[PDB]
């Protein structure tokens, strides 16, 4: 990929940055526009981590995963998605998005995670902020900066604590079952329509009490999660789908559902409420 005209920035993070660029190979100003992700503090440690991430994305080919384009301090060139993040899209089209459309997005997030498991990859950052919208009918998982290849010899011991599983908060352990936990949180968001007042951090802080800060919030989030304290059922959210959230939020890692089973449940529910 040829050294690209920085049109505008799409996403800015602490160590990462995603901008929209134009290839313009023949300098005809007609080359397709791509999404370029570069590191903020291009260190030696981050460069090594950022190098793996490029290898993981180029190894993934799925309808609900952003298609890698190539490389160009290195730069990661990806597919550009015009509708941006799902939480920006959903908030701007709430009244035009029903539960069936909601379950469509849920179903293809599920299958993308299913495919992810096949390669033995743990995403570790499953949230609506990392879900991009290509058109009004297809969303994709857009970031893999925290993804860790499961070792050859079932978990990876290594932050968005309000999306984390209890074993990740305590033992710093991440697995497919920890991604299942975070998926249930993603399902929670999906049905609150990205209302900030009902966001998981805003909801957990009211249950914990906001006279707490620093790492003492993590202390009380652990004690609350261990005492069967969970995010409430969002209003309008059917009972059957709220149970999927609770099933993902089981303290016993062994009883959390699989991603293949969630995709079939989501599809069955979506078709059942579509045909009456
Ligand atoms: C770790 C921090 S991070 O910096 O590295 N980081 C955040 C991250 C989360 C994820 N995934 N992100 C991805 C994109 C992104 N956006 C797009 N299209 C658009 C199109 C329109 C708009 C827009 O209207 O602007 C507003 C502010 C949304 C209204 C924005 C984006 N296409 C993409 N292709 C690949 C990535 C990507 C932006 N942020 C990756």
Curated annotation (Swiss-Prot):
Effect of residue 37 to E: Loss of ability to up-regulate potassium voltage-gated channel activity of KCNA3
An annotated GO cellular component: interleukin-23 receptor complex
UniProt-annotated location(s): Endomembrane system; Cytoplasm; Nucleus
Protein kinase domain sequence ranges: 4-267
Record: active site: 125
Protein name listed in UniProt: Tyrosine-protein kinase JAK2
UniProt free text on domains: Possesses 2 protein kinase domains. The second one probably contains the catalytic domain, while the presence of slight differences suggest a different role for protein kinase 1.
Family, as annotated: Belongs to the protein kinase superfamily. Tyr protein kinase family. JAK subfamily.
Keywords for this protein: Adaptive immunity, ATP-binding, Chromatin regulator, Chromosomal rearrangement, Cytoplasm, Disease variant, Immunity, Innate immunity, Kinase, Magnesium, Membrane, Metal-binding, Nucleotide-binding, Nucleus, Phosphoprotein, Proto-oncogene, Repeat, SH2 domain, Transferase, Tyrosine-protein kinase, Ubl conjugation
Modification Phosphotyrosine, positions: 23, 115, 121, 155-156
Residues of the full protein shown: 844 to 1132 of 1132
Gene name per UniProt: JAK2
Protein species of origin: Homo sapiens (Human)
Entry comment describing in which tissues the protein is expressed: Ubiquitously expressed throughout most tissues.
Subunit organization: Interacts with EPOR, LYN, SIRPA, SH2B1 and TEC. Interacts with IL23R. Interacts with SKB1. Interacts with STAM2. Interacts with IFNGR2 (via intracellular domain). Interacts with LEPR (Isoform B). Interacts with HSP90AB1; promotes functional activation in a heat shock-dependent manner. Interacts with STRA6. Interacts with RHEX; this interaction occurs in a erythropoietin (EPO)-dependent manner. Interacts with ASB2; the interaction targets JAK2 for Notch-induced proteasomal degradation. Interacts with MPL/TPOR.
Function, as annotated: Non-receptor tyrosine kinase involved in various processes such as cell growth, development, differentiation or histone modifications. Mediates essential signaling events in both innate and adaptive immunity. In the cytoplasm, plays a pivotal role in signal transduction via its association with type I receptors such as growth hormone (GHR), prolactin (PRLR), leptin (LEPR), erythropoietin (EPOR), thrombopoietin receptor (MPL/TPOR); or type II receptors including IFN-alpha, IFN-beta, IFN-gamma and multiple interleukins.
Taxonomic classification: Eukaryota, Metazoa, Chordata, Craniata, Vertebrata
Annotated disease: Chromosomal aberrations involving JAK2 are found in both chronic and acute forms of eosinophilic, lymphoblastic and myeloid leukemia. Translocation t(8;9)(p22;p24) with PCM1 links the protein kinase domain of JAK2 to the major portion of PCM1. Translocation t(9;12)(p24;p13) with ETV6. Budd-Chiari syndrome: A syndrome caused by obstruction of hepatic venous outflow involving either the hepatic veins or the terminal segment of the inferior vena cava. Obstructions are generally caused by thrombosis and lead to hepatic congestion and ischemic necrosis. Clinical manifestations observed in the majority of patients include hepatomegaly, right upper quadrant pain and abdominal ascites.
